């Protein structure tokens, strides 16, 4: 009777499970952008392989086939609108080539670091969670925002966060009492 609540998975999994070449490599990415799960990496490989064998499929169509452009130009719009594809690259032969790290450097937990304002890449992840920084009045506690380079302009802290103008905060207030 119920209508079926749709779901899906967000992470693939390496077939060879112990390729230490790719396993060190995986961790360098992990301990760089501040990730907890190697499946935060496996996750963002997944969409990439989707974008690719979405995109790779379009360059088979006869050049400028009706739908190849509609969702072609729909695709490259989506990725510059988050700023992973750079503005030179909006004719979609180069979207096949989005090496993974581009996606990670466009996180929230990442740019909150590259804007200064994160002493470490992990001071980032720790304050995002804790009622700290926002974009509008809209607090965000998801270190995987994928900020869209438009709203990257306003990433100052929140008004209720006692690091960007607030009341003292919970344990300060009786360190002083």
């Amino acid at each position: 009777p119920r209508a079926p609540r749709t779901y899906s998975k967000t992470y693939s999994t390496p077939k060879r499970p112990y390729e230490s070449s790719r396993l060190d490599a995986e961790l360098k990415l992990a301990g760089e952008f501040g990730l907890k799960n190697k499946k935060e990496i496996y996750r963002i490989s997944f969409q990439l392989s989707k974008i690719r064998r979405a995109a790779r499929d379009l360059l088979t169509r006869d050049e400028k086939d009706p739908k190849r452009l509609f969702e072609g130009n729909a695709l490259i719009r989506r990725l510059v609108r988050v700023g992973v594809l750079s503005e030179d690259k909006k004719k979609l032969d180069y979207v096949l080539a989005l090496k993974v790290e581009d996606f990670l450097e466009r996180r929230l937990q990442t740019q909150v670091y590259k804007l200064g304002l994160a002493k470490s890449v992990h001071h980032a992840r720790v304050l995002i969670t804790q009622r700290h920084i926002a974009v509008g009045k809209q607090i965000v506690n998801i270190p995987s925002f994928m900020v869209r380079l438009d709203s990257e302009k306003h990433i100052d802290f929140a008004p209720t966060s006692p690091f960007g103008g607030a009341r003292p905060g919970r344990v300060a207030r009786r360190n002083a009492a």
Binding site: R2, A3, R5, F70
Partner: protein, 260 residues
């Protein structure tokens, strides 16, 4: 299976009613009436979903029981009444009137119309034959029988309906070059006015249509609804007059209205 089904699950509901899946389990099963079940729309969705006058279903019943609503003239208090294409819904409060007319996306659109226009009607005649005592009658897409029409009305033609009373006065004909309205398939919504009609004795005569953008298409004759003369209709078409904007056409103009 032991007689009449009287329930309608969701996702059995007609898509063009645009109900969200999770609001329960069921759509409102339209009642029996003028319009085919799958080819109609009930009052409770009109007053609740597309037009958002009422919040819940319980309210829609409260609304109708005050004789507020009229369709084609009459009080018509059936919460699930099968109101269909080309009906008129006068609304006593607000002095609003709506003719029921498709988009070119094929759904039922909200379309306010004049008080003058709110008192005539058309119908694709679906049958014509003699009857009791030999008085001929026409019957049309909407479920009414007009006794004593002219011998010149054959079948497949539209008819003006006074609907303060019964009779017809004018009857547009089905010939090469009359304004048509596709009322099925999903060329549903597109418009205009002939190319020609392939006979195909045995069934399923094919109707060729040329929209007023020099774009052809074909649909079956059962689903072509002549509505008059080139560019000269006999009712008020809705916005964009059904000329099947492309996906890129539609989103090029989608971003044409770009600056606030």
């Amino acid at each position: 299976a032991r007689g009449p089904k009287k329930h309608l699950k969701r996702l059995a509901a007609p898509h063009h009613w645009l109900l969200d899946k999770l609001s329960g389990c069921y759509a409102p099963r339209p009642s029996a009436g003028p319009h085919k079940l799958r080819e109609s729309l009930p009052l409770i969705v009109f007053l609740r979903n597309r037009l958002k006058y009422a919040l819940n279903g319980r309210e829609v019943k409260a609304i109708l029981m005050q004789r507020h609503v009229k369709v084609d003239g009459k009080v018509r208090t059936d919460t699930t009444y099968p109101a269909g294409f080309m009906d008129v819904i006068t609304l006593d409060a607000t002095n609003e009137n709506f003719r029921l007319v498709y988009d070119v996306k094929g759904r039922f659109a909200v379309h306010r119309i004049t008080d003058e226009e709110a008192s005539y009607k058309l119908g694709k005649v679906k049958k014509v034959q003699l009857g009791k005592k030999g008085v001929p009658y026409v019957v049309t897409h909407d479920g009414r029988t007009i006794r004593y029409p002219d011998p010149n009305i054959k079948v497949n033609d539209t008819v003006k309906i006074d609907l303060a009373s019964g009779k017809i006065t004018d009857f547009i004909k089905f010939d090469a070059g009359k304004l048509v309205y596709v009322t099925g398939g999903r060329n549903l919504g597109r418009i205009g006015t002939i190319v020609h009609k392939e006979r195909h004795d045995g069934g399923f005569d094919l109707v060729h249509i040329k929209d007023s953008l020099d774009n052809t298409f074909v649909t079956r004759l059962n689903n072509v609804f002549v509505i008059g003369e080139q560019g000269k209709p006999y009712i008020s078409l809705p916005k964009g007059k059904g000329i099947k904007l492309s996906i890129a056409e539609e989103r090029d103009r989608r971003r044409a209205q770009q600056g606030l």
